[PDB]
Scaffold this active site. Sequence first.
Site, mmCIF file in Angstrom:
data_model
loop_
_atom_site.group_PDB
_atom_site.id
_atom_site.type_symbol
_atom_site.label_atom_id
_atom_site.label_comp_id
_atom_site.label_asym_id
_atom_site.label_seq_id
_atom_site.Cartn_x
_atom_site.Cartn_y
_atom_site.Cartn_z
ATOM 1 N N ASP A 253 0.794 -1.248 0.000
ATOM 2 C CA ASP A 253 0.000 0.000 0.000
ATOM 3 C C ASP A 253 0.837 1.316 0.000
ATOM 4 O OD1 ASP A 253 -1.267 -2.567 1.080
ATOM 5 O OD2 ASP A 253 -3.127 -1.383 1.218
ATOM 6 N N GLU B 120 8.470 -11.484 2.445
ATOM 7 C CA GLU B 120 9.355 -10.481 3.071
ATOM 8 C C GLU B 120 10.399 -11.114 3.968
ATOM 9 O OE1 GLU B 120 6.014 -10.373 3.011
ATOM 10 O OE2 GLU B 120 5.420 -8.350 2.199
ATOM 11 N N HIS C 102 -6.514 0.050 8.025
ATOM 12 C CA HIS C 102 -5.825 -1.080 7.370
ATOM 13 C C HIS C 102 -4.342 -1.243 7.745
ATOM 14 C CE1 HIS C 102 -5.626 -3.776 3.561
ATOM 15 N NE2 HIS C 102 -6.395 -4.341 4.456
ATOM 16 N N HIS C 103 -4.004 -2.392 8.327
ATOM 17 C CA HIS C 103 -2.665 -2.682 8.848
ATOM 18 C C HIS C 103 -1.989 -1.945 9.976
ATOM 19 C CE1 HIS C 103 -2.217 -2.077 4.635
ATOM 20 N NE2 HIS C 103 -2.226 -3.358 4.335
ATOM 21 N N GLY D 192 21.945 -18.300 13.666
ATOM 22 C CA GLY D 192 21.427 -19.690 13.486
ATOM 23 C C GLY D 192 19.928 -19.828 13.254
ATOM 24 N N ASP E 208 17.176 -30.661 4.126
ATOM 25 C CA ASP E 208 15.751 -30.847 3.780
ATOM 26 C C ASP E 208 14.797 -30.145 4.761
ATOM 27 O OD1 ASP E 208 15.266 -34.390 5.009
ATOM 28 O OD2 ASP E 208 16.344 -32.756 5.941
ATOM 29 N N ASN F 92 18.102 -36.234 4.855
ATOM 30 C CA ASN F 92 18.302 -37.228 5.911
ATOM 31 C C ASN F 92 16.982 -37.450 6.663
ATOM 32 O OD1 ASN F 92 18.387 -34.749 7.234
ATOM 33 N ND2 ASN F 92 20.620 -34.772 7.636
ATOM 34 N N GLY G 38 14.572 -35.391 7.804
ATOM 35 C CA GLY G 38 14.194 -34.658 9.016
ATOM 36 C C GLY G 38 15.307 -33.824 9.622
ATOM 37 N N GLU H 262 18.939 -31.955 15.398
ATOM 38 C CA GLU H 262 17.993 -31.946 16.532
ATOM 39 C C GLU H 262 17.811 -33.377 17.127
ATOM 40 O OE1 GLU H 262 17.577 -28.917 17.532
ATOM 41 O OE2 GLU H 262 15.675 -28.062 16.814
HETATM 42 C C1 LIG Z 1 2.621 -9.536 3.838
HETATM 43 C C2 LIG Z 1 2.051 -8.557 2.843
HETATM 44 N N1 LIG Z 1 2.829 -8.081 1.818
HETATM 45 C C3 LIG Z 1 2.336 -7.192 0.855
HETATM 46 C C4 LIG Z 1 1.009 -6.766 0.976
HETATM 47 C C5 LIG Z 1 0.402 -5.835 -0.049
HETATM 48 N N2 LIG Z 1 -0.536 -6.533 -0.984
HETATM 49 C C6 LIG Z 1 -1.911 -6.421 -0.893
HETATM 50 S S1 LIG Z 1 -2.748 -7.248 -2.013
HETATM 51 C C7 LIG Z 1 -1.381 -7.731 -2.727
HETATM 52 C C8 LIG Z 1 -1.567 -8.589 -3.982
HETATM 53 C C9 LIG Z 1 -2.472 -9.789 -3.836
HETATM 54 O O1 LIG Z 1 -2.300 -10.577 -5.006
HETATM 55 P P1 LIG Z 1 -3.103 -11.901 -5.305
HETATM 56 O O2 LIG Z 1 -3.124 -12.881 -4.161
HETATM 57 O O3 LIG Z 1 -2.576 -12.669 -6.483
HETATM 58 O O4 LIG Z 1 -4.603 -11.327 -5.387
HETATM 59 P P2 LIG Z 1 -5.426 -10.859 -6.705
HETATM 60 O O5 LIG Z 1 -4.556 -10.992 -7.945
HETATM 61 O O6 LIG Z 1 -6.608 -11.800 -6.783
HETATM 62 O O7 LIG Z 1 -5.750 -9.461 -6.433
HETATM 63 C C10 LIG Z 1 -0.217 -7.276 -2.094
HETATM 64 C C11 LIG Z 1 1.217 -7.563 -2.543
HETATM 65 C C12 LIG Z 1 0.212 -7.230 2.047
HETATM 66 N N3 LIG Z 1 -1.062 -6.821 2.217
HETATM 67 N N4 LIG Z 1 0.738 -8.133 2.937
HETATM 68 C C1 LIG Z 2 13.901 -20.046 12.315
HETATM 69 C C2 LIG Z 2 14.241 -21.246 13.158
HETATM 70 N N1 LIG Z 2 13.274 -22.110 13.669
HETATM 71 C C3 LIG Z 2 13.677 -23.256 14.431
HETATM 72 C C4 LIG Z 2 15.057 -23.450 14.685
HETATM 73 C C5 LIG Z 2 15.590 -24.651 15.444
HETATM 74 N N2 LIG Z 2 16.393 -25.576 14.590
HETATM 75 C C6 LIG Z 2 17.793 -25.672 14.519
HETATM 76 S S1 LIG Z 2 18.447 -26.842 13.519
HETATM 77 C C7 LIG Z 2 16.920 -27.356 13.194
HETATM 78 C C8 LIG Z 2 16.828 -28.570 12.267
HETATM 79 C C9 LIG Z 2 17.431 -28.366 10.884
HETATM 80 O O1 LIG Z 2 17.157 -29.503 10.054
HETATM 81 P P1 LIG Z 2 17.831 -29.667 8.577
HETATM 82 O O2 LIG Z 2 17.855 -28.414 7.742
HETATM 83 O O3 LIG Z 2 17.149 -30.768 7.785
HETATM 84 O O4 LIG Z 2 19.353 -30.099 8.907
HETATM 85 P P2 LIG Z 2 20.112 -31.478 9.275
HETATM 86 O O5 LIG Z 2 20.566 -31.277 10.668
HETATM 87 O O6 LIG Z 2 19.156 -32.634 9.142
HETATM 88 O O7 LIG Z 2 21.239 -31.603 8.267
HETATM 89 C C10 LIG Z 2 15.884 -26.622 13.832
HETATM 90 C C11 LIG Z 2 14.400 -26.907 13.723
HETATM 91 C C12 LIG Z 2 15.990 -22.498 14.201
HETATM 92 N N3 LIG Z 2 17.276 -22.598 14.426
HETATM 93 N N4 LIG Z 2 15.590 -21.432 13.419
HETATM 94 MG MG LIG Z 3 17.596 -32.860 7.636
#
Ligand SMILES: Cc1ncc(C[n+]2csc(CCOP(=O)(O)OP(=O)(O)O)c2C)c(N)n1
Ligand SMILES: Cc1ncc(C[n+]2csc(CCOP(=O)(O)OP(=O)(O)O)c2C)c(N)n1
Ligand SMILES: [Mg+2]
Lengths: 560, 557
Positions: free
Chosen positions: B27, B50, B110-111, B409, B440, B467, B469, B473
């Site tokens: 907006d 974002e 709004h927002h 991290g 993964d 692996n 999961g 962890e």
């Molecule tokens: C997290 C976030 N980022 C950006 C916006 C701004 N925003 C409002 S509507 C919109 C587009 C929505 O697009 P779409 O889901 O494809 O809907 P449509 O094409 O049916 O309008 C954006 C980017 C928002 N409201 N929230």
């Molecule tokens: C944003 C966020 N949410 C949760 C965690 C906790 N966390 C640390 S490592 C991990 C698991 C990562 O798994 P993967 O990417 O598959 O790596 P692997 O150890 O199996 O190689 C999680 C959930 C974090 N560090 N950051």
């Molecule tokens: Mg893994």
Amino acid sequence: SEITLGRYLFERLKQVEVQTIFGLPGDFNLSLLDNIYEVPGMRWAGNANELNAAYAADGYARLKGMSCIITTFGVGELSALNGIAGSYAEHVGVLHVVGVPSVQAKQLLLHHTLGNGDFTVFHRMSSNISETTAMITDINTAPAEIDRCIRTTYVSQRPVYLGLPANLVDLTVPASLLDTPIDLSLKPNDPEAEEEVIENVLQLIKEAKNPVILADACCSRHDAKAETKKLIDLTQFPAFVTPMGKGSIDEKHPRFGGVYVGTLSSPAVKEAVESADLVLSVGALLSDFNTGSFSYSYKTKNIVEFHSDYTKIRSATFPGVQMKFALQKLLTKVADAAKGYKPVPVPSEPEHNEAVADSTPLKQEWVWTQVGEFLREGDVVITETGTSAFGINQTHFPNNTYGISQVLWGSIGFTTGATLGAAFAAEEIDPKKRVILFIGDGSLQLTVQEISTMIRWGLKPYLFVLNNDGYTIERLIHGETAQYNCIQNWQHLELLPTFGAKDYEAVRVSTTGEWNKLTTDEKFQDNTRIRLIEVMLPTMDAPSNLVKQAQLTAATNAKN
Amino acid sequence: SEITLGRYLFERLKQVEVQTIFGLPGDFNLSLLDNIYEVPGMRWAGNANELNAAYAADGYARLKGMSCIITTFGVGELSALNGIAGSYAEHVGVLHVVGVPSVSSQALLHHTLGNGDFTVFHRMSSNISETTAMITDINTAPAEIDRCIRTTYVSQRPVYLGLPANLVDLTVPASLLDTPIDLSLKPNDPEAEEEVIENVLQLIKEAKNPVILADACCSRHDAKAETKKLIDLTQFPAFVTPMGKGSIDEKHPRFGGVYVGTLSSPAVKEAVESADLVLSVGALLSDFNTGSFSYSYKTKNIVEFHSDYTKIRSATFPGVQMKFALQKLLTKVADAAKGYKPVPVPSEPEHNEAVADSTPLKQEWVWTQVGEFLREGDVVITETGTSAFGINQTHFPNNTYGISQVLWGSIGFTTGATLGAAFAAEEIDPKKRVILFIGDGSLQLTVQEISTMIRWGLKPYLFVLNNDGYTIERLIHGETAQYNCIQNWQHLELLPTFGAKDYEAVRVSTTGEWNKLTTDEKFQDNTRIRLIEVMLPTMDAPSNLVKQAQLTAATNA
Ligand SMILES: Cc1ncc(C[n+]2csc(CCOP(=O)(O)OP(=O)(O)O)c2C)c(N)n1
Ligand SMILES: Cc1ncc(C[n+]2csc(CCOP(=O)(O)OP(=O)(O)O)c2C)c(N)n1
Ligand SMILES: [Mg+2]
Ligand SMILES: [Mg+2]
């Protein structure tokens, strides 16, 4: 006989009907999460990220009454904040539990890695978007502190932040605490303030020649749907919903006159509401504003707003006079007050589309009416910010339809996580209840991975993806052909099997005949597996009053 | 001659080598974004969310020196906060520009949270910003914009710039762009510096087992050549933290590997912990605990060169800057270290012993084998999980730029960082490869940012370690807990599902399969985007993590 404080949390959440827990594991919540598997009927969703987890908790709370998301210190909690903020803005009861470093605070300081000079920083950030907060530090008060956080979440219908140090969750408390329920009842109203409010409202009703009832966002959230139906029944006043209120008035009511969307309303709805000499707004939140899309307001100032928290009468504010109790008292006397009323007829819509050729390309004005043929009693209908949210305002709901449309906060992507949460909640309520999502192709992109968690749990939403080649709603406001309004084209039909779905349907519809063939099929109407319907629409296509309004805004010198 | 405030921003960004802008439209930023297309050479990434855009801005800034993400009021900016906080934690120079309501509408529902407080989100970000501006005066705006840019690049931490929608379309003299933003550092106070230098020189004179340690800010704040000269002139053992890997070119005979505190190798652990002086360059923190390791030193005899100040034991010298202070030290340091008698430093195998092509892939094998694939100039990105630990055993060619967010991290970070780094790399040299090792589990959090790579025809190598999961962890707690399990995805189908036309996606399960792919001449050229799904046992990890897991199993018995 003792249980860990961790186990105590989940036993409490179970008592208040919270069965599914959202979030992701991390450093400071793993032993906490172990308790879920020991509490009959609790589960851990296993979200694909924390923002989606929070959106899902919001969706679940909307249907079940409250919800719980669990993250970890720093990385997880900060990732959820936009979810939490939207729940705060729209009054949704989400308990956000954050596992933190164990409790000269050596452990907190070694683990606290931001390199600012303050380990309370994340808590203080959450405080801005929380009804209350708690950071548990003492085993002897922790049970009461958790009960308070759960009660506040439920009663106030806003997020609560609960910080649980890892070392406390393993300490034990007496199991017998669970034998006394959390008090979830609202505090009674002040008899004198309530009585004043009621006297004034009755006098205003007696004096009105063209009163209307307007159900808003909190009508259902604060458990006042019955009360509102009763108000319409006893007064016979024309009744309308705002876009946030849609579903809160069963739409087959003879006195239901439609959805009020300001300048976006049908002419008759606009005239009906804007010609009112008194507005009874129930569950008010959406109260008067401006957006680059729509201009919601132009009525009388003779409004009574029953907010969950207080009541407003014209200019006067009676703090602490709560909606549900205030409504109930009003109902004891409202038939008498409205005894002098001659029933002005209500707006109506055509109920169905005109028949057209099966070859006819799908357009939004047709789609939104036609959705009405597919909906059934008990459905949950979720619509994303974008054309979907505006389109659904023309759709006719059957009785007992629960609408979710995040009109105030307006965070695109919300609905994929909200669909997950609602589908968990709906399965717990009634396995026959369908959850129907309408999400734009743009919005889908921000939160698309939460589809994976729907598959993981064998949940069966209808995911209608509106493919119009980008951000149409933004195109209509500004940058009709700007690269920032365009998006990478995804293969939407391949999403389900890419996330490991084995039992699913993925279908594309480009015509009226294709839409009808799919949506009138008896097997499709049964919620038997997860489905993605890709709906092919023109890029500049949108609901009509929206298009007309876009041309208005662009013509006028009125501005920002 | 006059230009819009919006145009001024982007022109100032172009002058500081920022060419790609991250974020999502909304907006109060659409008229702002229009200006991007008005500036030759600038582009709008078009991110898929974002959070990922912030992760991408961070990767971009790591390579190019700073970046800009633009988000919308409330919903955009709050989604990005974990990205920003990470850049704060690890000192990455990210400018977060937020389009806000005009300073006369505020004066909307709004927002906003429903309270009429339009400052709550700015106040939330102030906690994770070096500084903030909320622009309200067209007359001071060019100066506030320059200030924010300068502080972003100089402090290498995030800055929050709020831009009202009415202000962006207002005009300022184009002439202002004709004087550069000043990004220079003032020299050190000579008194304080002379004091730091003499004190460090005495410490070197007296030390029997001194070591050099390069951390993240060694790279960030442009001390790599001074750090190399330090090693040359002293011949002291020289290590990197995980965050600083690549900061010392690893073909130096005095490079002894990576210090990971308690999770270091036997030899590295001993070489560092027996030091009687540590010369630390660019420490982020010299003291912290992770969920996985403890980081600290044995001696109290610690010298820390930071960008902003210097620490010697318990004394801080504010304002004594790393680069200038290191330059002065090097003029005198060979003399101080004149007596020192070298010795072999620790090392990890450069090669694997030949085995059968059918040999199933194991982590320990793969991290050493990666060294055969890497080349000079590569960008090597590793996610939180087993990957961040395994890469520590990989030999980097000279001039390898590592990205590994060990201090903050946040899993999921690397998908975005890879996008940001791939844009920045393409701007530096289209032939510079960007190589990602992501689990993964982490991929799931930020997967859609693959879409934006495809959109821009970027050509990273995406190694996905499957692996089944969250293995790191599982090894810590809940080996077979459902919360450590993940929905299994078809990784080979991610690229075409997000619209990729020109790509490869291949699965490797054995030693032989790994080798056929990576020694293939055509594969080694960054001609198209690639996903490589690497199949690994569930409980497999680098042996330090395996050792830790058996240590707390044989214990707690
Ligand atoms: C997290 C976030 N980022 C950006 C916006 C701004 N925003 C409002 S509507 C919109 C587009 C929505 O697009 P779409 O889901 O494809 O809907 P449509 O094409 O049916 O309008 C954006 C980017 C928002 N409201 N929230
Ligand atoms: C944003 C966020 N949410 C949760 C965690 C906790 N966390 C640390 S490592 C991990 C698991 C990562 O798994 P993967 O990417 O598959 O790596 P692997 O150890 O199996 O190689 C999680 C959930 C974090 N560090 N950051
Ligand atoms: Mg893994
Ligand atoms: Mg769209």
